[PDB]
Amino acid sequence: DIRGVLDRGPTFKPYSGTAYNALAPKGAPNPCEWDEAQKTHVFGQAPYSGINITKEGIQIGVEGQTPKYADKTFQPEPQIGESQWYETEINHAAGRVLKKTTPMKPCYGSYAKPTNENGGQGILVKQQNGKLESQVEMQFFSTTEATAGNGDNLTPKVVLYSEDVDIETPDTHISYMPTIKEGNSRELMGQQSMPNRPNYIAFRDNFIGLMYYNSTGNMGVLAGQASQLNAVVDLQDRNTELSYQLLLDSIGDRTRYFSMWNQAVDSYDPDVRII
Amino acid sequence: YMPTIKEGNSRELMGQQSMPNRPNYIAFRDNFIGLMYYNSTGNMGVLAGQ
Amino acid sequence: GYNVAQCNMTKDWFLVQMLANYNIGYQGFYIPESYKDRMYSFFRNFQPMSRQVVDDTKYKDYQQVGILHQHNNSGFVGYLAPTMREGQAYPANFPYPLIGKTAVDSITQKKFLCDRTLWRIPFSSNFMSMGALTDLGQNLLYANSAHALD
Amino acid sequence: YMNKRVVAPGLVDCYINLGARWSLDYMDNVNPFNHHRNAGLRYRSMLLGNGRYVPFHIQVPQKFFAIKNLLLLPGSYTYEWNFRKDVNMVLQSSLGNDLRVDGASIKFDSICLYATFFPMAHNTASTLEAMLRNDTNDQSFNDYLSAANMLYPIPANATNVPISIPSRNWAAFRGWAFTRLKTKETPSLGSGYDPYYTYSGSIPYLDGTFYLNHTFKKVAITFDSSVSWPGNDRLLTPNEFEIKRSVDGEGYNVAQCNMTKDWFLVQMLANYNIGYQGFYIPESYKDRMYSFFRNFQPMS
Amino acid sequence: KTAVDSITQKKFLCDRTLWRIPFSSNFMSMGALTDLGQNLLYANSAHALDMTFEVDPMDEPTLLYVLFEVFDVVRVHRPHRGVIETVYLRTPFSAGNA
Amino acid sequence: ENHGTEDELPNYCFPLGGVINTETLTKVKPKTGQENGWEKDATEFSDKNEIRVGNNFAMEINLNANLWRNFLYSNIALYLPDKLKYSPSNVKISDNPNTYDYMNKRVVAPGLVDCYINLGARWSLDYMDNVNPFNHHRNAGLRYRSMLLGN
Amino acid sequence: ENHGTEDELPNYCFPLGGVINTETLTKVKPKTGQENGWEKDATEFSDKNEIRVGNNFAMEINLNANLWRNFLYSNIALYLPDKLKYSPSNVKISDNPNTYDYMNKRVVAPGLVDCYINLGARWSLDYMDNVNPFNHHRNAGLRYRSMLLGN
Ligand SMILES: [Ca+2]
């Protein structure tokens, strides 16, 4: 009987494909925003329907007569939108986006640790006064043409929240880098991602190699207690292993598997080798 | 998804969606279990000489 | 460490079942022959299962995310319903990665599964099936006296 | 290196060898047991669980033949054994990445031993002991494989390999059995540990998976510089066995394969004593998994 | 109706298995101890051996793995309490100086 | 046998970039002092920012139904008694009813056999009872014999 | 036994006519005896021809993921214990927790089970251990018996 601690390594990938927004097309970029020349451009989206915007925020509900506004930590949720399919009029949409600090990656296989029970993600920082707090900003947009007129209204139409999250790809790699120029730039949006190859790891069949065999350097000993006369003699040109193998083969059916001895048989697929 | 709560016909609707019903089989059991009484003093079977 | 077969079962019960259904075990273990192992037997219907899961305490960033805020496949499928698609795109938040260079400390859970069979316990002196009757069924101590069962 | 490289899908697309039961060339000499569809391998990997950090608890059987089934008798004895810790040996991969570099590890906490007895009646046990002690009732044991094993190097692009055996008695022989192995794959035993060895496929020389037997050409045997065993003018080509022919001008191939008749005949005989009364598919029981006829594949 | 002129290629695969060669006068498995061994015992002689292998070429170092099927047995004797003696024997290729 | 198809979900597609019908817009900042004020900021944010509103484009498809349809069709259809086909229109055809051409250029309407034939019932079609089921195209033995000779 | 899916290649559905987005153009020929320069030639060519510049437009999908997702939702999720489902909105359902209607018109969030659960680990869900795995719609024997009486 053996008990112990095993660390399979940082390259243990037992599944085909990846497990993060697998449905997403293999080219669609995340809502991002980058720098050019010397200004800033934004690529974004806004699925949520609102009611009325203000410099204070975006209305979500009504408590009595006081308007209610979204919590900047986790609203609006990215997976909430209008259900009706036939398009209609909307005037107070909102969305989320990542600031230029965090590097850009495709939507394929994109992860970010949640940082509050509500479910939002956002890099906490240590506030100047001893505490921890988030840092989000709000941006407002109105129609272009609607800027060729007195500020008679200029009412903002679309609201974005900007964020920064520690994105990382745990299982996929870039399959196309258009240009070696590092940093955030307009080129990088052409990149595409591919999942890593599957890769298993385990104990061998019947635990081959776990215990020493056929080596006078470390031969095992079974003996009478007082006599201390070795009862086992081993030679080094006898491969004990191909042995258990074929013997098991015969005196039974290897096709089946058993757990107690980890009894399983290495075997390929009959339709891979021959096409 | 029934966008509204009223009835008749109203733009409101024309936006619904449909969904198939779950499958459901019904037939006799294996070896007709329960088709003949057993171990029931109310309905003991009889095989005897006339 | 009384667990065996890499399941959550003690050795003794495994031995008892193997004996009571195959007279096998006093001389090792192996795979019983097919014709001695019918459909409702023990061995054919024994499946051990095990997994790893995130550790609530030892990991210091554990955050219980309810169902109402798991936004994997954010903008490409409905919300808490099989209905039409919605939502925008945005990196996800679930589930934690158990692999790769940034794995999170985990714990293990094991169990087994067994069906189409009832647990059997033979009334022998040493549990070995040795005939349509038993030795213990004939000894006077249990055959010429009275007893209560608990 | 094996995960970031890339290969154009034009090599093998839906317009390759159409309608032909055939296998690609470069794939023949690459072991197919290194894959992600080895049902045994995926079973064994899943059985530990999908995580990365695992406490494990196993029981390892004893396999030495000389003490496999020996019936011990009362008294005290000492039992001492060893175990490896080299992560690259005990662990099996699916690609061939040397796990030492990648940084896998294993550690042992405690070892325990178990044993089972029989509640046999005491007087009967004593009688059985005494009877078993008389020297006319010793214990005999024979290994299953029971052969001598030799390895000979073969350099790159070689075509000929001669081997020699100095003069010796040959009482009670049984015969030959050969196969081939791909260097970088085979390990190098004989010491506590080795380096200079990176890979992880499926040690073939040590488990069964064998996969290049599709490329030998001819084997010749001589005794004392004059005898062409088995001689006495039996085979189609008396001097030696020629397994597969490249160019045939006389029709010596069978089963539409490129294998000479004689080799088929010899293999059938030595497997099932079948062939002096025609041919026919051997029954299941006399043809186990590792048999010959189970693993015969002709392609064209 | 516009096919090109073609040639054919044939081959075979036999993974998982070992070519073998029995030692008899008829290649038939007629028992554990084949006749030719007994006949050599009759002769009471000694001889040398040569073998030659010709293989397909490969662009990689390789090994040739050869098994000589032989006899090998162990007999175990237990005279007293808490003692055990054993005798090995492997033929033809023996291993002991006594 | 016909249990229908398991298609209780949609398989919408999407556009290559995830968004195509985007719309331009411009930065808006709250005017200082007076409340509800607004004005334009063009110092840092570029004049033109592309943004989508609402959901994104997508095209629906039903997979399992298509797979089944295709199959049933193929097989059972293109093998019903001839009394159920009809010649093509304004295309050259053969006249001998036993050649390759005649068996190839004939056409047969899928409506005869589709994914709604005697649903939930284990059954075989009457027209096929008196037609050889070995002259099909899955005689694994026939396929093997054809392959072994070559392609 | 969730191995994941093989989706290393994309699957693109193309427009029906090959291309759709296209501009018009006009014939041009070199102007002789000038080392450069060009002139219109509508003598024998239409002055307005169709041409598309760049790669054609086509939408993407992911197949194996969707198939596996449909299978998981269809054959597992619906059978979860009633305690985890929730009532629908604005639809009448019966009160008896046993009738066919009440089971049919309930609804269960697909997010509970999808292709991102227990990846790589052969495992059975705790909520399903104590649910009978025999009252099920893929049970071969029961299906056979139901068919055998017709449909
Ligand atoms: Ca134009």
Side-chain angles (χ1 to χ4, degrees):
Chain A
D1 245 9
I2 309 183
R3 300 200 311 262
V5 170
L6 180 66
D7 176 9
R8 290 157 145 173
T11 81
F12 181 96
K13 191 187 176 310
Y15 51 74
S16 310
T18 169
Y20 295 101
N21 312 333
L23 291 131
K26 287 155 168 44
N30 296 259
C32 64
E33 53 184 27
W34 69 100
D35 304 15
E36 283 187 356
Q38 209 294 318
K39 289 196 177 186
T40 293
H41 305 250
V42 181
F43 194 144
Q45 196 191 5
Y48 182 45
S49 163
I51 300 185
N52 166 36
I53 313 183
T54 174
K55 70 146 186 59
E56 176 274 346
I58 159 183
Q59 194 184 29
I60 172 187
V62 278
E63 174 193 3
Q65 292 184 342
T66 310
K68 312 208 53 54
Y69 303 98
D71 185 0
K72 64 177 189 175
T73 42
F74 67 104
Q75 280 166 329
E77 294 201 48
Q79 69 287 13
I80 304 180
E82 4 74 306
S83 49
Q84 62 284 40
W85 73 271
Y86 68 135
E87 66 286 56
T88 62
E89 300 274 357
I90 46 189
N91 321 308
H92 304 84
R96 305 181 83 91
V97 82
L98 332 168
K99 305 168 211 172
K100 59 179 185 174
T101 3
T102 287
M104 285 176 306
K105 303 286 193 174
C107 171
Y108 210 179
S110 316
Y111 184 86
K113 52 175 73 173
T115 45
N116 43 34
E117 171 177 352
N118 264 321
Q121 43 210 340
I123 301 170
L124 287 191
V125 89
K126 215 286 294 90
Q127 213 281 346
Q128 282 66 17
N129 179 272
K131 256 174 284 79
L132 316 175
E133 212 273 293
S134 78
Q135 277 72 32
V136 287
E137 289 173 330
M138 294 184 292
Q139 271 51 49
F140 325 91
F141 298 81
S142 306
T143 270
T144 303
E145 207 71 345
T147 329
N150 168 247
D152 71 273
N153 282 134
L154 235 214
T155 57
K157 178 179 181 175
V158 184
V159 182
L160 282 190
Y161 287 68
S162 81
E163 330 199 55
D164 13 49
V165 267
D166 190 0
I167 186 187
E168 69 188 13
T169 56
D171 55 1
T172 62
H173 65 330
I174 317 300
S175 72
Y176 188 2
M177 271 295 309
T179 295
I180 199 182
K181 183 180 66 176
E182 28 59 39
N184 291 341
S185 88
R186 64 191 318 270
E187 298 83 332
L188 293 198
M189 307 327 289
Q191 59 189 6
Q192 307 178 189
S193 189
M194 165 162 72
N196 284 332
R197 316 181 63 172
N199 185 90
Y200 297 87
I201 248 172
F203 282 116
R204 295 170 173 275
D205 182 10
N206 308 128
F207 307 85
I208 289 180
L210 228 186
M211 39 174 41
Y212 259 145
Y213 272 90
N214 323 8
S215 295
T216 96
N218 293 257
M219 188 173 53
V221 171
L222 147 65
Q225 217 314 299
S227 175
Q228 280 192 354
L229 168 71
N230 179 7
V232 194
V233 179
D234 240 8
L235 316 178
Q236 73 160 329
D237 62 357
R238 171 193 288 104
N239 140 39
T240 299
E241 298 274 13
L242 202 7
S243 107
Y244 193 84
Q245 271 328 305
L246 306 206
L247 149 65
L248 238 189
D249 150 67
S250 151
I251 69 175
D253 218 347
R254 193 78 131 141
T255 100
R256 284 161 50 161
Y257 300 128
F258 176 51
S259 68
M260 185 169 186
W261 312 122
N262 192 6
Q263 201 169 329
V265 38
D266 308 15
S267 48
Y268 54 91
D269 163 79
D271 220 316
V272 165
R273 174 83 104 158
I274 279 196
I275 301 171
Chain B
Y1 172 19
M2 270 237 325
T4 44
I5 208 122
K6 316 135 269 167
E7 20 218 340
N9 261 133
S10 96
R11 152 183 285 288
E12 283 56 24
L13 274 90
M14 304 272 344
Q16 51 190 357
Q17 300 179 195
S18 175
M19 174 192 164
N21 292 339
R22 321 179 61 178
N24 163 84
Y25 310 97
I26 268 187
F28 289 105
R29 295 173 170 271
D30 161 52
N31 294 328
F32 302 146
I33 290 189
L35 239 184
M36 308 179 71
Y37 273 93
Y38 288 100
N39 327 94
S40 316
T41 83
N43 305 328
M44 189 84 69
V46 179
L47 159 58
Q50 189 169 20
Chain C
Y2 288 171
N3 301 269
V4 262
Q6 289 157 167
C7 138
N8 61 9
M9 179 178 312
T10 45
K11 303 194 183 66
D12 310 15
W13 188 262
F14 191 20
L15 177 63
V16 170
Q17 286 314 316
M18 285 300 300
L19 295 181
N21 277 329
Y22 300 96
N23 278 316
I24 296 192
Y26 279 107
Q27 307 202 20
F29 302 80
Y30 37 86
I31 318 165
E33 294 77 15
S34 303
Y35 78 99
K36 282 208 304 181
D37 172 76
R38 290 304 190 188
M39 164 169 306
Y40 291 55
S41 318
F42 171 97
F43 188 90
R44 186 111 59 184
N45 308 351
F46 171 91
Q47 308 282 12
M49 296 169 294
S50 300
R51 85 185 170 187
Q52 296 83 15
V53 287
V54 313
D55 189 349
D56 55 357
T57 58
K58 199 174 178 185
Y59 193 56
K60 60 181 191 62
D61 286 0
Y62 182 55
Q63 288 305 134
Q64 175 177 344
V65 177
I67 174 61
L68 317 178
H69 313 76
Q70 299 192 3
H71 60 61
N72 183 20
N73 291 282
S74 75
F76 297 98
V77 89
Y79 175 87
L80 308 191
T83 69
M84 202 181 65
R85 58 97 190 87
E86 51 169 309
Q88 52 159 142
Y90 205 48
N93 62 324
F94 189 90
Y96 298 81
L98 298 150
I99 73 189
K101 60 176 184 175
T102 71
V104 294
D105 309 17
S106 52
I107 80 172
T108 321
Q109 291 173 357
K110 303 184 171 180
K111 54 180 156 227
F112 70 87
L113 185 52
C114 189
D115 38 332
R116 290 159 108 178
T117 161
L118 35 157
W119 300 110
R120 233 134 194 177
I121 293 180
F123 193 10
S124 134
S125 67
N126 46 262
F127 314 111
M128 295 211 59
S129 170
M130 302 182 310
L133 199 43
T134 117
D135 33 330
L136 290 184
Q138 302 173 150
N139 183 309
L140 298 96
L141 185 45
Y142 304 111
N144 294 144
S145 32
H147 292 290
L149 180 64
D150 290 333
Chain D
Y1 198 105
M2 280 180 287
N3 190 87
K4 305 200 173 185
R5 299 269 276 189
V6 73
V7 44
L11 300 186
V12 227
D13 200 316
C14 78
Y15 48 83
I16 185 54
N17 308 333
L18 243 194
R21 182 178 207 272
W22 168 280
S23 81
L24 272 178
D25 273 359
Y26 328 94
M27 280 288 299
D28 284 6
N29 307 23
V30 177
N31 164 33
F33 288 88
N34 307 137
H35 199 268
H36 67 260
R37 278 183 181 256
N38 261 278
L41 186 45
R42 55 178 44 185
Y43 186 112
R44 299 209 298 288
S45 186
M46 288 183 162
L47 201 42
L48 297 153
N50 65 338
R52 183 184 166 179
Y53 305 155
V54 171
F56 73 136
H57 160 88
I58 52 167
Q59 339 79 354
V60 177
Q62 158 59 266
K63 278 184 294 165
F64 204 120
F65 82 114
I67 44 195
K68 180 154 58 61
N69 310 321
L70 160 63
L71 182 50
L72 238 194
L73 290 187
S76 304
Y77 312 89
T78 167
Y79 203 173
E80 163 175 337
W81 212 264
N82 291 34
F83 302 106
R84 284 193 190 98
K85 302 172 77 178
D86 174 294
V87 298
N88 196 8
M89 288 284 302
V90 331
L91 307 161
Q92 183 184 41
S93 133
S94 63
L95 270 63
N97 44 342
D98 142 59
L99 309 182
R100 306 178 192 175
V101 159
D102 286 18
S105 174
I106 178 181
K107 201 178 68 63
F108 289 149
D109 327 344
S110 50
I111 298 195
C112 305
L113 173 54
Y114 284 101
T116 307
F117 292 158
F118 191 112
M120 174 180 296
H122 275 188
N123 54 22
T124 298
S126 55
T127 292
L128 201 68
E129 159 206 12
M131 299 227 302
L132 272 171
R133 285 192 166 284
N134 258 335
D135 69 330
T136 175
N137 292 15
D138 299 331
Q139 315 279 17
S140 85
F141 283 115
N142 178 25
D143 165 288
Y144 198 112
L145 168 59
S146 330
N149 334 316
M150 299 170 193
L151 302 187
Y152 289 127
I154 303 162
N157 304 70
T159 314
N160 259 19
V161 169
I163 61 184
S164 161
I165 294 297
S167 184
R168 178 184 176 77
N169 174 16
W170 300 86
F173 205 75
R174 304 180 53 175
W176 286 261
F178 46 82
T179 332
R180 188 175 187 170
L181 293 187
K182 226 153 102 236
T183 296
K184 57 195 268 12
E185 278 158 284
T186 293
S188 310
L189 243 168
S191 72
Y193 147 102
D194 133 289
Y196 272 78
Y197 162 57
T198 55
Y199 149 86
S200 167
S202 155
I203 288 70
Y205 161 81
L206 236 178
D207 72 350
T209 66
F210 265 124
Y211 69 88
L212 286 194
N213 279 355
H214 70 295
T215 68
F216 270 108
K217 286 179 162 294
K218 73 172 195 174
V219 180
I221 313 185
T222 39
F223 264 133
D224 304 358
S225 325
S226 61
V227 173
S228 180
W229 194 99
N232 295 328
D233 202 318
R234 311 301 196 199
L235 316 172
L236 233 306
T237 52
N239 282 20
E240 78 302 287
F241 311 81
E242 270 182 347
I243 348 188
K244 61 173 193 169
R245 288 210 174 183
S246 69
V247 192
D248 187 317
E250 315 170 5
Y252 282 2
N253 333 337
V254 272
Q256 301 108 339
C257 157
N258 68 320
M259 158 188 304
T260 38
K261 303 195 187 54
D262 332 356
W263 196 262
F264 198 12
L265 183 52
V266 171
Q267 291 297 338
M268 294 298 303
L269 289 189
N271 267 259
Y272 332 104
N273 294 274
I274 293 193
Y276 289 111
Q277 297 165 323
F279 294 71
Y280 45 85
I281 37 191
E283 287 79 343
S284 305
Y285 67 140
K286 294 195 304 176
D287 197 76
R288 291 313 208 183
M289 176 179 297
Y290 291 70
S291 310
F292 167 89
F293 186 81
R294 181 77 74 167
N295 306 4
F296 189 79
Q297 304 282 28
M299 302 174 300
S300 296
Chain E
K1 60 172 292 190
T2 54
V4 316
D5 322 338
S6 62
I7 76 180
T8 335
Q9 296 208 38
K10 302 178 171 299
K11 64 177 182 174
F12 78 111
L13 201 54
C14 213
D15 35 9
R16 295 171 98 198
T17 185
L18 327 182
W19 292 131
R20 25 190 20 121
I21 290 184
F23 201 19
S24 114
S25 57
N26 58 13
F27 311 101
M28 304 203 50
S29 180
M30 300 178 300
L33 175 52
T34 85
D35 64 358
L36 266 249
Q38 300 189 91
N39 200 5
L40 286 184
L41 169 58
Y42 205 120
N44 191 344
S45 163
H47 315 78
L49 167 65
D50 304 319
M51 300 173 61
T52 303
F53 289 92
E54 167 183 353
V55 315
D56 299 21
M58 301 187 59
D59 43 7
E60 183 175 347
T62 42
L63 288 200
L64 176 57
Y65 175 95
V66 153
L67 292 191
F68 290 104
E69 310 159 316
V70 304
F71 264 96
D72 188 6
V73 202
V74 197
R75 176 165 178 160
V76 185
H77 175 271
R78 245 177 322 283
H80 271 146
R81 162 201 206 86
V83 217
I84 164 177
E85 289 188 349
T86 53
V87 177
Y88 295 91
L89 175 51
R90 185 177 66 163
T91 62
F93 292 87
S94 312
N97 279 34
Chain F
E1 192 159 5
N2 188 7
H3 334 258
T5 65
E6 285 168 332
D7 56 337
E8 309 83 328
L9 276 178
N11 288 302
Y12 309 134
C13 75
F14 292 100
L16 210 159
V19 33
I20 55 116
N21 272 346
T22 177
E23 311 224 329
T24 330
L25 301 166
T26 324
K27 189 77 173 76
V28 174
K29 120 178 184 180
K31 183 183 62 182
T32 171
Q34 154 62 21
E35 304 79 348
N36 309 72
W38 307 103
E39 54 133 323
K40 187 174 60 178
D41 177 1
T43 61
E44 309 177 15
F45 296 79
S46 302
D47 71 330
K48 299 180 182 183
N49 286 262
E50 10 184 356
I51 277 186
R52 164 67 190 190
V53 195
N55 293 322
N56 55 7
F57 208 2
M59 309 195 66
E60 187 173 340
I61 184 184
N62 195 10
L63 289 162
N64 310 99
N66 269 83
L67 277 176
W68 179 269
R69 202 148 181 289
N70 265 196
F71 158 55
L72 274 216
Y73 181 64
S74 159
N75 307 22
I76 285 112
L78 348 149
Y79 291 134
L80 274 107
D82 157 274
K83 187 226 336 244
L84 306 187
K85 313 178 182 189
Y86 73 101
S87 309
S89 56
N90 69 266
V91 182
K92 212 60 160 56
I93 203 182
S94 171
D95 46 324
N96 155 273
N98 290 339
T99 340
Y100 196 13
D101 194 66
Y102 184 91
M103 270 180 177
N104 205 11
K105 278 154 189 177
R106 280 282 220 181
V107 77
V108 38
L112 289 170
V113 166
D114 203 351
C115 69
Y116 45 81
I117 37 184
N118 326 83
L119 241 191
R122 182 161 179 275
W123 173 272
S124 59
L125 314 177
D126 307 332
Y127 298 127
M128 304 307 303
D129 268 359
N130 298 22
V131 154
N132 189 328
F134 290 105
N135 307 343
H136 184 245
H137 75 210
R138 272 158 190 248
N139 267 357
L142 196 45
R143 162 177 307 162
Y144 183 98
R145 298 214 290 280
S146 181
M147 287 186 178
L148 193 42
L149 275 181
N151 70 339
Chain G
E1 183 180 337
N2 173 22
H3 287 277
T5 46
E6 298 150 322
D7 48 357
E8 294 78 338
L9 269 196
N11 343 326
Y12 294 177
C13 44
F14 290 81
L16 212 159
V19 88
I20 15 87
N21 288 187
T22 159
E23 72 208 56
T24 330
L25 276 186
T26 307
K27 186 60 164 60
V28 164
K29 61 177 180 181
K31 179 176 307 304
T32 173
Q34 206 196 10
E35 170 270 355
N36 65 326
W38 308 86
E39 42 214 16
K40 184 206 66 177
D41 192 333
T43 69
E44 311 177 8
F45 287 112
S46 166
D47 31 17
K48 31 197 176 183
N49 317 336
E50 280 286 354
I51 276 183
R52 167 59 149 76
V53 190
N55 311 316
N56 53 339
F57 150 86
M59 307 179 62
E60 187 180 335
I61 207 249
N62 191 291
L63 262 164
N64 286 116
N66 281 270
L67 258 167
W68 165 265
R69 185 173 178 273
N70 285 263
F71 171 78
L72 290 203
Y73 181 90
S74 177
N75 284 178
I76 285 186
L78 314 158
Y79 292 138
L80 253 110
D82 169 85
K83 72 198 295 180
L84 294 195
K85 303 178 175 180
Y86 70 111
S87 307
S89 120
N90 327 352
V91 179
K92 283 101 175 180
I93 72 172
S94 178
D95 51 2
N96 156 43
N98 283 342
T99 329
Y100 175 49
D101 219 57
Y102 166 66
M103 283 187 177
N104 198 7
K105 289 181 177 176
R106 276 263 194 176
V107 62
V108 39
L112 266 181
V113 160
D114 196 334
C115 71
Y116 57 90
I117 183 59
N118 281 320
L119 238 193
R122 156 194 255 268
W123 176 274
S124 79
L125 326 167
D126 305 316
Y127 295 145
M128 284 297 305
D129 275 3
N130 299 22
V131 178
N132 171 19
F134 263 101
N135 300 142
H136 186 283
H137 89 276
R138 202 187 278 259
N139 170 23
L142 188 51
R143 140 194 304 178
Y144 185 15
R145 304 218 291 288
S146 185
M147 296 180 179
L148 200 37
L149 275 177
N151 67 338

